[PDB]
């Protein structure tokens with residue numbers, strides 16, 4: 001059975017957007033970072049290591065606005081033990097109606113593929129936002145490309161992507177804009 005429960009009533013009419021974490025919304029690292037947005041302690045084989053998390057610019061405006069426009073789902077290749085605490089801390093608005101992690105990805109030809117068909121949502125109303133063209137090899141026509149973000153604090157891509165999602169949020173069939 002499908003990766004998601006049935007949409008709640010607030011969410012059923014909306015387009016479902018699958019959103020990536022790392023290098024899409026945040027960039028985390030084991031190397032200490034000086035003025036970090038948050039620091040997550042992560043237990044790895046019994047030893048706690050600090051993870052230094054930087055937020056991509058305009059991520060707050062971005063997530064609060066997508067949480068309105070869409071049934072937003074976090075879908076990352078990372079492990080819950082790291083991604084859940086990052087989410088609790090980023091997601092100030094209850095934007096993510098679900099969280100999917102490494103076990104929900106398909107490992108295909110050495111890549112973590114987000115298989116939109118296991119989602120349980122009509123595919124004409126599913127979008128995937130990911131820095132990584134491989135996570136959507138199976139659904140290239142459901143995808144909004146975004147560049148990988150590491151630390152460039154002049155980045156404006158989340159802000160610049162918003163009027164396009166504003167338009168997508170209203171169509172009956174995303175393929176009518178993307179093209180399948």
Ligand SMILES: COCCCOc1ccnc(C[S@@](=O)c2nc3ccccc3[nH]2)c1C
Nearest residue numbers: 022028029030042044049051077078079082
């Ligand atoms: C001591 O290093 C061993 C790493 C074990 O993996 C873990 C475990 C917990 N947390 C993290 C933090 S995160 O930066 C991260 N992003 C990733 C993207 C792809 C694959 C693994 C990833 N891991 C990682 C990478």
Ligand SMILES: [Mg+2]
Nearest residue numbers: 020022023131
């Ligand atoms: Mg990524």
